[PDB]
Symmetry: D2
Subunit: 317 residues, 4 copies
């Protein structure tokens, strides 16, 4: 029967026998996402155009404000903030949340899909909360997911027991569970990478890509897709299968995507869905960070596709 995100979260909080603090965090997040969706869809824009009487900064304020008001967090790391934000002792909670309020911000002007990425850690070292508390490997994530503002708005949530997708019915401001226990196809038929950096790809990426266009056994070549918005390329991967890649290159010898609020959440989601997320040399989730804005290379998607690339990495080493 009808399952709303509000009901699902509360139920899981009950089975889990939690104190209701994490439930509060999850409900504040949901609220922040409906707010950003509305802003993203340009509601009320007639007022900027003088009918009479920023989107990334606004998103940052909504997230930070709604999260602090939940009384469940103590440390916040935003892609928009150079420093980790320590919550007032007044509003503190036991959770640390790393997030990208509006990923794909360069795409705003072209009206391409954008999203919000989040990762939630539980503060374990009980000392005054600080930046150090956010420096945990993703293998330590309690919950992670993202909201994609594409043709429709969807919220993907991942936790210990699985990945579930919720579609937003904008008519009643409610997220509906449209898919339970999501698992990615073992093998896909689409590869996703910015081939404009061909000149700077390592030999392993080079070989794999060419293997997709000219398959050794004359099978059907893979189709190519690259929206240029991580949340959008990763969501397509999750739903239809395949492989997404943002390896290291010249401008980004350590990749472009950040570990804490972009790489780790998508890797956590991928792994819970039955897929793989690697650096090419090691699992993304086992990297212990040193800088909150640390970057990391990432390859994620169907297990068989990711394994095939790993085998080529091993061969050129």
């Amino acid at each position: 029967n009808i399952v709303t995100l509000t009901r699902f979260v509360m139920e899981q909080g009950r089975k889990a026998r939690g104190t209701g603090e994490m439930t509060q965090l999850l409900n504040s997040l949901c609220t922040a996402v409906k707010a950003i969706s509305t802003a993203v869809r340009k509601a009320g824009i007639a007022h900027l155009y003088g009918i009479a009487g920023k989107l990334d900064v606004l998103s940052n304020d909504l997230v930070i404000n709604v999260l602090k008001s939940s009384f469940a967090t103590c440390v916040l790391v935003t892609e928009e903030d150079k420093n980790a934000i320590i919550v007032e002792p007044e509003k503190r909670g036991k959770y640390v949340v790393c997030f990208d309020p509006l990923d794909g911000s360069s795409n705003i002007d072209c009206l391409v899909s954008i999203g919000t990425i989040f990762g939630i850690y539980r503060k374990n070292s009980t000392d005054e909360p600080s930046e150090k508390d956010a420096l945990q490997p993703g293998r330590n994530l309690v919950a992670a997911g993202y909201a994609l503002y594409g043709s429709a708005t969807m919220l993907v949530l991942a936790m210990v027991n699985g990945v579930n997708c919720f579609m937003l019915d904008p008519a009643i401001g409610e997220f509906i569970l449209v898919d339970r226990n999501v698992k990615i196809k073992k093998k896909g038929s689409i590869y996703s990478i910015n081939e404009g950096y061909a000149k700077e790809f390592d030999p392993a990426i080079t070989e794999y890509i060419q293997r997709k266009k000219f398959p050794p056994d004359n099978s059907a070549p893979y189709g190519a897709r690259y929206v240029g918005s991580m949340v959008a390329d990763v969501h397509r991967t999750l739903v239809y299968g395949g492989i997404f890649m943002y390896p290291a290159n010249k401008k980004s010898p350590k990749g472009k995507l950040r570990l804490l609020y972009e790489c780790n959440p998508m890797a956590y989601v991928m792994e819970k869905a039955g897929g793989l997320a690697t650096t090419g040399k090691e699992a993304v989730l086992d990297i212990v960070p040193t800088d909150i804005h640390q970057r990391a290379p990432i390859i994620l998607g169907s297990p068989e596709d990711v394994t095939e690339l790993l085998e080529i990495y091993q061969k050129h080493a």
Copy 2:
């Protein structure tokens, strides 16, 4: 002071001393686009999931009905219909409309941007309306444009005087003019093509793509982007500059995109914005259609980029 689509179309109908038949038609399109936008964003989905107890199809039905009720059309060609729709003599006007109600339908499940494409012709000749009236070259278009259901919904309308972009304020259901007399960049920095077909690209396309990744003059390479929905790929091109391509290959020696309701509308917008739209051999708008579902290869975008490719084509002539 603010300009809405309704106000704009009306002032334009007035300066042109029209009978008001085309204004009625442009207002019918506006309404259809808002109705589709709403459906695309999933309003009401809670009911489909039993709160109280096909999208390409709904779109088709919406456009066809809203258009017939305009009393301004005589023939309608749809991507979804094998044969052209001849209007009941009662609601028969003088306009022929070609459209793709929801382009990128394959993308629906992944929530990737999708849109509506349309082209309007004035029925030439004085005899019982038939498919033959839609078979006019693109150069004979009265109006053409598209609606993109992406992060926000936008309608781009191109007519003899230029191209204008209207953003939908979903809060009041009104398209606000946000950019007027749009012109495209002379030279962009992004190329768009499905490189999964590399194995079957003609030698000219191969060389160009090669030149974008490894510039012979040691200039910075072009970035790559390919959403997978024409309306999104073309909209990005018009706004940020660059080039979009869908040449022939084993994927039909004639390309995949249809001439009447995909290629022509987009080529018209391009030319009006200052770009070019070619098949590599001739201008898209000058082709005399032979069938309403005729496909055609297409290359469009910034003039300097399109010309650079045309030069390579001539080389391999």
Copy 3:
């Protein structure tokens, strides 16, 4: 087949061979009403309460701006402004518009139904526009109507040919025609008046009210209803029949309601629907205004009920 306000106004402008100045004006009103509706229903209130960090006034500003930008008006009389607004010679059209942007403003805090009232005159005379152009008797109205923001938003438009009701589909921001050529019941069963002023009603009003509660012919008594917002009380009267009254008393020997932007528009709708609108002494539409904020007593509704009262008035003459 479905009729929208935009389509209707346009077909009507065409049958009447208008220049399209009044169509532009009616489309400007439509937009203003949708913008106000949205504000009334509190969309965006979360921001006023710090989610990310006057209504009568906003309404006034919306109508005045949207109307000026129509280039179809020369003089605007508002309930909120002491003096009439003369349009900048640039945006000067030939229409004079009288309106109450948000009637029942005192009701705002209790969330009782409220609405917008308007009357449109054609500037008679050929000299610099002034308040004097608004001082025309109601019988000289070109169009009049109201928008009611109640359980749903409805626009009622009355013109020489009749009265039509349009319901707002807030999902697509479009007014759909739901009732055409509306006529009122000959005799209703509800009387509407603020009986808190009993102490000061003239003897005729006293006797009538007495006759509705204790029918001398032993017929069933009339039911009583008095919302407190004229637009809601009048809309109920037009749809269900009955009588609405606001006679003189110590609450101004001339009544409370204004002639130009409250009484006249409503009297016009009434007469066009088949009812009557009198002061008890003369038809409201035949009064020659002396001042733009002139008040006048009013009695409107089903013809048999209004006539029954007029007879009682004559008795006490």
Copy 4:
């Protein structure tokens, strides 16, 4: 800072140290109300009007369906159902909810304010759940309140510690706490009753009403208001003060309003706000019902106004 209904309810559930079952009930109710609001505002009505591709019954289905899915109820009493609905042992919970899904249904066609009224009891006699479980005096209510669909949508919730009002921001489908610990003025200046039944009022009502129009000490007479929709007249009373009355008459020797799903909830709300709710002879909340559809006379509002009427009842006895 920003307080949503979701957050407020959860917080109160935590302080209360509840098992989260009642929180689930309250969250299901909230969802049902946003759904009914959307339906009431006529969203999607363009589809009934053939753009191509009941309100009281629909409301009943939404409430019943959303409540059963909460797994927190065992008995339901609807104004629309002749019999109390026993929930399947599968979906049972410990709560009994009495409700009027859409009060003021006769007013739908006139677009007057309407609302949903609810009352929540906790099943105490642990025997197979049945109708008898609903037959509890209102003094036993755990929570009660109503949703008013007027100019804006508001949800009033009352519990042991106070009455709080939440306004719906339709843009993000979220209820915001706009007023905390609401208390009604000790004395008001508006009386609300259907004077059309004058002929059948008892001597006590008769005297009091006339005392409001012709005050003994020449003070200012009370103003009169009567929307004809209980939720709307009761809300105005709560916010602005005064007295609402629906005494017994001929057609209704025991009043018209029902005890369990109309009278008790509003009486519970009134008492928590510091006002009074009486039958004229005794408190509404202390009546032990015998029939689930039992009717009862009711007088509620400011304490000083209600006391003054009670003194007149005592005098004529």
